[PDB]
Amino acid sequence: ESIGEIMGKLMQGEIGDEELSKRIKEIFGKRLQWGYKPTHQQQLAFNLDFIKSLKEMYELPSAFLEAAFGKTIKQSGCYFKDETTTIDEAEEASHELYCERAQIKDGQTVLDIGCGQGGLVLHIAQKYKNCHVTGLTNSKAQKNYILMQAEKLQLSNVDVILADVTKHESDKTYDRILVIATIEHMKNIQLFMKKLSTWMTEDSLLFVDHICHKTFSHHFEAIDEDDWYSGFIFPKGCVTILSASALLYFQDDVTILDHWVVNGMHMARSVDAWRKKLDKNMELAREILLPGLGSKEAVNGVITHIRTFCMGGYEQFSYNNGEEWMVAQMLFKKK
Amino acid sequence: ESIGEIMGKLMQGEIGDEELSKRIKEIFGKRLQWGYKPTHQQQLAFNLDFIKSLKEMYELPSAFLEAAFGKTIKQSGCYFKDETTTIDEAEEASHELYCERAQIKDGQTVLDIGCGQGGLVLHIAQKYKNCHVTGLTNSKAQKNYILMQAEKLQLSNVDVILADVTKHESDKTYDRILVIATIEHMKNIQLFMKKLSTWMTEDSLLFVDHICHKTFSHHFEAIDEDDWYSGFIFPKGCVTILSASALLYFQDDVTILDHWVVNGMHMARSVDAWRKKLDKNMELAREILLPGLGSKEAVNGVITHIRTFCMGGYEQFSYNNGEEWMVAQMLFKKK
Ligand SMILES: C[S@@+](CC[C@H](N)C(=O)[O-])C[C@H]1O[C@@H](n2cnc3c(N)ncnc32)[C@H](O)[C@@H]1O
Ligand SMILES: C[S@@+](CC[C@H](N)C(=O)[O-])C[C@H]1O[C@@H](n2cnc3c(N)ncnc32)[C@H](O)[C@@H]1O
Numbered sequence: 209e210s211i212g213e214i215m216g217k218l219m220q221g222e223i224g225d226e227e228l229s230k231r232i233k234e235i236f237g238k239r240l241q242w243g244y245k246p247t248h249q250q251q252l253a254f255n256l257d258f259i260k261s262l263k264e265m266y267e268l269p270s271a272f273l274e275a276a277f278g279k280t281i282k283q284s285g286c287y288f289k290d291e292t293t294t295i296d297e298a299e300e301a302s303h304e305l306y307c308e309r310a311q312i313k314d315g316q317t318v319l320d321i322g323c324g325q326g327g328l329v330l331h332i333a334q335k336y337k338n339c340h341v342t343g344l345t346n347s348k349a350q351k352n353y354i355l356m357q358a359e360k361l362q363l364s365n366v367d368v369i370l371a372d373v374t375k376h377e378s379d380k381t382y383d384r385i386l387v388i389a390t391i392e393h394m395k396n397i398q399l400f401m402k403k404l405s406t407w408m409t410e411d412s413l414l415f416v417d418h419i420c421h422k423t424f425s426h427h428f429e430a431i432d433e434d435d436w437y438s439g440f441i442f443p444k445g446c447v448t449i450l451s452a453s454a455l456l457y458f459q460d461d462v463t464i465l466d467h468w469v470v471n472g473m474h475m476a477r478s479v480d481a482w483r484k485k486l487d488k489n490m491e492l493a494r495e496i497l498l499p500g501l502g503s504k505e506a507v508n509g510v511i512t513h514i515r516t517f518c519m520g521g522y523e524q525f526s527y528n529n530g531e532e533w534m535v536a537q538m539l540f541k542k543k
Numbered sequence: 544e545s546i547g548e549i550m551g552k553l554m555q556g557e558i559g560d561e562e563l564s565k566r567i568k569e570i571f572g573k574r575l576q577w578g579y580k581p582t583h584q585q586q587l588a589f590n591l592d593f594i595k596s597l598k599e600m601y602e603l604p605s606a607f608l609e610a611a612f613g614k615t616i617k618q619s620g621c622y623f624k625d626e627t628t629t630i631d632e633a634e635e636a637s638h639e640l641y642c643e644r645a646q647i648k649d650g651q652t653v654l655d656i657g658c659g660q661g662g663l664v665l666h667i668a669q670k671y672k673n674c675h676v677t678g679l680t681n682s683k684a685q686k687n688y689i690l691m692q693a694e695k696l697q698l699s700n701v702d703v704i705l706a707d708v709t710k711h712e713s714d715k716t717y718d719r720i721l722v723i724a725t726i727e728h729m730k731n732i733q734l735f736m737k738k739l740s741t742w743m744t745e746d747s748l749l750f751v752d753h754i755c756h757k758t759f760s761h762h763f764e765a766i767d768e769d770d771w772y773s774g775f776i777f778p779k780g781c782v783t784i785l786s787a788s789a790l791l792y793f794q795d796d797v798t799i800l801d802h803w804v805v806n807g808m809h810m811a812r813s814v815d816a817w818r819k820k821l822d823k824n825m826e827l828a829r830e831i832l833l834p835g836l837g838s839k840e841a842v843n844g845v846i847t848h849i850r851t852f853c854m855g856g857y858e859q860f861s862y863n864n865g866e867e868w869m870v871a872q873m874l875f876k877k878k
């Protein structure tokens with residue numbers, strides 16, 4: 209059983225959902241075997257080795273995005289109160305959670321780093337009309353989308369910075385900096401945190417939300433030759449899954465004030481909703497993508513990628529009733 | 544079954560070792576039930592609540608001490624390589640571990656806070672003749688003992704500061720600060736850490752060793768009315784057991800560089816050796832104490848206290864093969 213084989217059957221839609229879930233679950237189970245140590249002594253030795261190594265280091269059309277994701281195209285874990293919470297409500301609930309945890313108050317300058325399609329930017333701007341809300345994104349498409357939404361919603365307190373955060377230089381400081389599902393993509397965390405501190409004053413607060421494992425850190429990459437999933441989903445080996453505590457060791461330039469995690473079932477419910485909505489709008493999605501992609505085969509490839517991401521994400525975050533992979537949140541002030 | 548009852552039978556030597564161990568083990572088991580939460584979400588909420596609360600806040604004759612403890616009267620967890628390691632060897636092995644983990648080098652100024660009988664002070668002074676080693680203790684007896692030992696061992700590089708560390712004021716800085724089994728007694732940790740930072744330069748390192756639980760923090764005090772042990776051992780409610788990670792949240796003035804724990808079986812072997820040696824020298828011990836104490840009953844009381852401490856300590860640190868309560872160590876530099 210080779211991976212070239214498994215990829216073939218996967219791309220040809222010949223693996224049933226039940227089998228696909230089972231295979232991915234098995235791959236995550238192996239990640240758990242790799243990460244858990246028999247003693248806390250060894251667990252910390254392993255975790256500290258990961259932290260020390262860290263310290264030495266085509267866009268989807270928005271119409272397609274709107275057909276797969278919730279209303280504000282949130283691309284991060286949402287928050288589900290009820291069994292009946294829709295993805296749209298879940299988006300809103302997690303926006304309000306961030307506002308509370310980050311102590312957003314009317315009149316503050318707010319910076320959202322890696323703002324995506326700007327669901328959070330738009331939420332804060334509308335809710336707090338005296339705040340000035342800046343999103344920062346490296347994507348031209350995202351900037352354009354946010355600006356269009358701000359205009360449609362009669363929001364005058366939004367700007368977007370188009371930039372690679374790791375290169376962006378400014379003397380500007382902000383009362384509140386929010387970093388949502390972005391730190392996972394950052395090559396140099398110590399330098400990232402340091403730069404963020406330079407955009408803060410003594411009164412600023414920094415809020416970070418990231419997917420985590422409760423116990424250990426890992427790069428999102430294949431353990432063994434049998435793992436076809438990790439490299440399929442992330443073909444760059446560029447996503448890091450920090451442990452729930454990893455950022456505690458990155459207080460060179462910022463100091464922790466609070467620390468939470470959100471159980472993984474919330475993220476699981478998120479990716480499940482995306483998957484279902486994508487399945488629902490499958491034909492429309494296929495039509496939307498065809499122009500920009502060329503082939504209907506290249507279409508199916510993109511769709512398979514996204515759907516499998518959702519299928520795998522479900523197994524990942526729901527493992528052990530959400531008590532393995534989950535979401536970590538931290539609040540810091542400047543040193 | 545009242546506690547007044549249990550204390551009576553205990554002081555009258557009418558509780559067998561097997562029963563005594565069982566009762567204490569049960570008390571610790573209840574502490575575990577109290578500390579472990581069903582989700583990491585709740586575990587952190589509980590742990591952060593403990594950390595936030597923190598941020599709002601007659602001497603035994605040395606001859607007796609020599610008859611109960613190892614050669615250098617180390618009053619902290621030792622380190623046992625073999626089944627045949629004596630308490631004396633265990634003392635030495637943990638001294639060398641500290642020297643490595645704290646990166647002690649010949650020629651440094653070294654400060655040992657809460658230095659006790661100065662086993663570590665004497666070890667560094669003898670091993671590194673160009674170091675200057677200062678112990679700081681609040682006990683006149685300890686200062687006297689260390690000074691006598693330094694004189695006997697022809698050590699010219701030792702001084703002792705007699706002081707309450709929480710009141711001590713000095714402009715003096717040191718290359719290395721060591722804090723061994725002392726932070727557990729500190730009322731205000733944030734202020735303690737802050738003061739330590741003022742005794743450091745950019746080149747200094749701070750090493751802290753403390754008893755911990757791997758998962759949660761707790762005051763060493765009775766949970767319920769059935770716990771006769773906690774208040775017997777520590778009648779002041781003045782000992783805090785931080786979690787293995789708690790000090791990560793105290794980086795206002797210092798930054799973490801490394802983090803370890805030592806499995807609890809080492810501490811268990813420590814208190815067991817003390818208990819056995821005390822049992823061995825029981826008659827001598829009783830004789831030594833009689834002058835300073837008056838009654839032979841007051842003697843038995845002190846001995847019961849110490850022995851029960853050892854008996855309980857064994858159950859505490861050996862719980863789950865040393866994977867509950869254990870020893871945490873951290874290395875920091877100044878901010
Ligand atoms: C997983 S998405 C999170 C989007 C948004 N925060 C949300 O929660 O929906 C990661 C975001 O970070 C952006 N990003 C990644 N690397 C970046 C970089 N170096 N500079 C700026 N933005 C970056 C991506 O384009 C995207 O907007
Ligand atoms: C558990 S003993 C540890 C002794 C020694 N470090 C060892 O490992 O054997 C705690 C030590 O801290 C000292 N101590 C406690 N509170 C203190 C304070 N406020 N100032 C100075 N020393 C203190 C005690 O007298 C004792 O020397």
Ligand SMILES: COc1ccc(C[C@H]2c3cc(O)c(OC)cc3CCN2C)cc1O
Nearest residue numbers: 283284285389390392419428479514517521
């Ligand atoms: C295919 O495009 C994407 C769609 C949605 C997300 C949301 C989210 C997320 C959700 C997961 O379930 C996951 O699995 C490890 C990884 C990530 C990494 C980035 N972010 C934290 C990210 C994307 O790159």
Ligand SMILES: COc1ccc(C[C@H]2c3cc(O)c(OC)cc3CCN2C)cc1O
Nearest residue numbers: 618619620724725727754763814849852856
């Ligand atoms: C009776 O006098 C003592 C003798 C030995 C110690 C060693 C050690 C220690 C060992 C334990 O096993 C323990 O149980 C929680 C608590 C403590 C607190 C202080 N220190 C970290 C401390 C003493 O106060």
